[PDB]
Structure formats: C-alpha cells, structure tokens
C-alpha cells in the first residue's frame, strides 16, 4: 500500500487515496485498475451506473485474491446503489449484480448514490412523456433498512451515504441500526465542505472527496467558470514544492484527513496522485488554500429536455444541495 489510511468506526482501514473510475471506459479501465494496484493503490471507487464494473471485475479477478498478486483482504472496494434500485425489494438484487460484475464475494463499502429514487426497472434514467425524470417516492430511510440486511448477509462490510445533506444524514442516523461510516461528496478548494465535514466528524462519518481535481473533463462545462487546476495559488504552490497542481489539490485534502478518489487512466498521473504523503503544507499555505472556498459546485445532475440543457433533479423536494449544507 502506497497510501496511508483513516480508521472507519467499523475498524476498517480506508486508504486516503483511491482510484476513481467514472468515465474510465470498457477497453481502458482494466489497464487503469491493474496499473493502480501494481503501483500500490489498495482502494477502488466504483458504481453500477458508471457502466464498467464488468470490466473492472475482470481486472480484479486477474490481480486480486488467492494465488494472485494482491490479497483480497488488503483491497478496499466501494460501490454505490443506483437511483432506480431504492425499493427494499430491489436492493439485494442490485448489490448481487454489482458483486457478480466485479467478481467479488463482498464489498468493503456500499453507498446510497443519491437520497432520491427513480422509477423501478431496468432503465437507469426512466423518463416521462415530456422527457423529464420519472421519480419513485421510496424514502431513503426505507432504503437504508434494506441496505442493513446486506451487512447481515456478509455481502457488504460497511455502509455509507453519497450526496446527502446534513439534515438527511441526521434523518438516516435516527433510524440506523448499522451506522453510516462514510459520506462521499464533491469536495476541493472551491467547495471546501467545511461545515458538512465538521458535521460528519461529530457523527462518526469519514468524508470522501469526489471530483477532488475539479473534474476538469466533465461534459458541458461553463467556459466562464474557472478551472481549479489552473488556479494561481495552486500553480504557485506546485512550483514551490516541485509537484503537480493535482498533487497540491490532493495534499490539501489528505492533510485535512479527507479521503480523495481522483480518477485517471494516465499511468503517470495515477502514480503521482498517490504520492501526496511525503510533503506537508505550512499553516500559512493551508490558509491560502482555505481562502479559495467559494461555493462552486461542478457536479450537478443535468438533462437535455426540449432542446435545452437543464438541471435533472434540482427541483425535487429531496434534492440534497438546497439546504446550506
Ligand atoms: N458519488 C458521486 O455522485 C460521484 C460523482 C462524481 C464522481 N464520483 C467519483 O469520484 C471520482 C473522481 O471524480 P471525477 O472523475 O469527477 O474527477 P477528478 O478525479 O476530479 O478529475 C478527473 C479528470 O482529471 C484528470 N486527471 C487525473 N489526474 C490528473 C493529474 N495528476 N493532473 C492533471 N489531470 C489529472 C483526468 O484525466 P485522465 O483520466 O485522462 O488522466 C480526468 O480528466 C470519479 O471517478 C468517481 O469515482 C462520484
Ligand atoms: C454515468 O452517469 C452519470 C452521468 C452524469 C453525471 C453528472 C454530471 S456529468 C457532468 O459533466 N456534470 C457536470 C455538469 O453538468 O456541469 C455532471 O454534473 C453523473 C453520473 O454518474 C454519477 C456519478 O458521477 O457518480
């Protein structure tokens, strides 16, 4: 293991650096997984919705397990339950499909991808006549209880939440027999999540930062919005430390003890992204980076409806991002 860890409340050690796999396509992801594991990654972040678990599974079967290059117990694998699978009856089949594709016997962590549900079925984006999303009203508290049964079946070691707000977290905690262990949200110097991180610390949830590098090749970017990797302060620190802008972004987080899952398919970047535990920022440098916070969220679900590109879910009563945190 190249990265250091944090201790989850379950007793699990979670490496502070994991490999993100969103947009890592079938035909490239297998190579990315194998390279990452070889250079010391022991944490992979996956999701059914990314459309690549089948291929990730082939890589893990080659590389991980008895008689292979990496012992299964040394590997931390996260997946996520997609929006169409919030019904208590659909939770186990969804997980078992993910286990099958990944060719694993268990996950180390399984997250509820969003608090709100989509219509049950085999369309991951079910749509109305008008082309807007068709929702299902299963409450996330009922989904949570069904996720708990999976821990009892030995299928998942830990559970957590993705894109939940502080109120929704507290709502889950009021009924949780198995406590969420991790919250995964967008986090980087433009969206520091300071209040939500503090909230999680108080309740025993470790935080994972998704899009820790500003997701710079995300679809339909605003040309007027800044590029986090081009941030002058970041470029300045990169110079000073003889490191890449990406390493500065990741160091800032792991110095805060925030787990980061940067995605890359480029072997050199994969390697450099885990090499963030051999330098330290001064208190003044941390302060420079903390000053960049500006409530700039890059990852907002979007849709094409009637010729215009619109927020997918922003109007939903259960949308997480409306509260202050
Ligand atoms: N829970 C959720 O709703 C959710 C949502 C979004 C993301 N996530 C997770 O978080 C992971 C990471 O977030 P993300 O994929 O949105 O974006 P990201 O990790 O912030 O950035 C990925 C982009 O940065 C590039 N990159 C990687 N390393 C670099 C480096 N060292 N220097 C310069 N560029 C570099 C990648 O290019 P190359 O790959 O071409 O090298 C890719 O274009 C995802 O893969 C996914 O696992 C979860
Ligand atoms: C593969 O399915 C997905 C499709 C779209 C998204 C969300 C996106 S994609 C994208 O370019 N952006 C940014 C934006 O719309 O400004 C988003 O907010 C997220 C998806 O997966 C959920 C995830 O990233 O974990």
Swiss-Prot record:
Cell compartment(s), UniProt: Cytoplasm, Cytosol; Apical cell membrane
Keyword Oxidoreductase: yes
SUPFAM superfamilies in the cross-refs: NAD(P)-linked oxidoreductase
GO molecular function per UniProt: aldose reductase (NADPH) activity; allyl-alcohol dehydrogenase activity; glucuronolactone reductase activity; glycerol dehydrogenase (NADP+) activity; L-glucuronate reductase activity; methylglyoxal reductase (NADPH) (acetol producing) activity; S-nitrosoglutathione reductase (NADPH) activity
Active site annotation, chain numbering: 50
Sites where the protein binds NADP(+): 11-22, 45, 162-163, 211, 213, 215-216, 263-266, 269, 272-273
Enzyme class: oxidoreductase
Major place of residence: cytoplasm
Keyword Acetylation appears in the UniProt entry: yes
GO biological process: aldehyde catabolic process; cellular detoxification of aldehyde; D-glucuronate catabolic process; L-ascorbic acid biosynthetic process; lipid metabolic process
Modified sites of kind N6-acetyllysine: 127
GO CC terms, sorted: apical plasma membrane; cytosol
The reaction(s) this protein catalyses: a primary alcohol + NADP(+) = an aldehyde + NADPH + H(+); glycerol + NADP(+) = D-glyceraldehyde + NADPH + H(+); glycerol + NADP(+) = L-glyceraldehyde + NADPH + H(+); L-gulonate + NADP(+) = aldehydo-D-glucuronate + NADPH + H(+)
InterPro entries assigned: AKR, AKR1A, Aldo/ket_reductase_CS, NADP_OxRdtase_dom, NADP_OxRdtase_dom_sf
Residues flagged as site, Lowers pKa of active site Tyr: 80
Modified residues (Phosphoserine): 4, 211
PTM sites of type N6-succinyllysine: 127, 145
EC number, UniProt record: 1.1.1.2, 1.1.1.372, 1.1.1.54, 1.1.1.19
Role description: Catalyzes the NADPH-dependent reduction of a wide variety of carbonyl-containing compounds to their corresponding alcohols. Displays enzymatic activity towards endogenous metabolites such as aromatic and aliphatic aldehydes, ketones, monosaccharides and bile acids, with a preference for negatively charged substrates, such as glucuronate and succinic semialdehyde. Plays an important role in ascorbic acid biosynthesis by catalyzing the reduction of D-glucuronic acid and D-glucurono-gamma-lactone. Functions as a detoxifiying enzyme by reducing a range of toxic aldehydes.
Known partners and oligomeric status: Monomer.
Family: Belongs to the aldo/keto reductase family.
Record's protein name: Aldo-keto reductase family 1 member A1
């Amino acid at each position: 293991m190249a990265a250091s860890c944090v201790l989850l409340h379950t007793g699990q050690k979670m490496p502070l650096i994991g490999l993100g796999t969103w947009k890592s396509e079938p035909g490239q992801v297998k190579a990315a997984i194998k390279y990452a594991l070889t250079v010391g990654y022991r944490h992979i972040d996956c999701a059914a919705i990314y459309g690549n678990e089948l291929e990730i599974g082939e890589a893990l079967q080659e590389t991980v397990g008895p008689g292979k290059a990496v012992p299964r117990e040394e590997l931390f694998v996260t997946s996520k339950l997609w929006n169409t699978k919030h019904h208590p009856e659909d939770v186990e089949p969804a997980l078992r499909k993910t286990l099958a594709d990944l060719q694993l016997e268990y996950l180390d962590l399984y997250l509820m991808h969003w608090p709100y549900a989509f219509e049950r079925g085999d369309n991951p984006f079910p749509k109305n006549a008008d082309g807007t999303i068709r929702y299902d009203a299963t409450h996330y508290k009922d989904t949570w209880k069904a996720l708990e049964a999976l821990v009892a079946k030995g299928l998942v070691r830990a559970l957590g939440l993705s894109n939940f707000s502080s109120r929704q977290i507290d709502d889950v905690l009021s009924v949780a027999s198995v406590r969420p262990a991790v919250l995964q949200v967008e986090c980087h110097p433009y969206l520091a999540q300071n209040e939500l991180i503090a909230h999680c610390q108080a309740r025993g949830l470790e935080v994972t930062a998704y899009s820790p590098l500003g997701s710079s090749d995300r679809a339909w970017r605003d040309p007027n919005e800044p590029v986090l990797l081009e941030e002058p302060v970041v470029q300045a620190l990169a110079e000073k430390y003889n490191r890449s802008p990406a390493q500065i972004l990741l160091r800032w987080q792991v110095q805060r003890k925030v787990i980061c899952i940067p995605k890359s398919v480029t072997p050199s970047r994969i390697l450099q992204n885990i090499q963030v535990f051999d330098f330290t920022f001064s208190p003044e440098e941390m302060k420079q980076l903390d000053a960049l916070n500006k409530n700039l969220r890059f990852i907002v679900p979007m849709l094409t409806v009637d010729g215009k590109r619109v927020p997918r879910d922003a109007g939903h009563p259960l949308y997480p991002f409306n509260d202050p945190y």
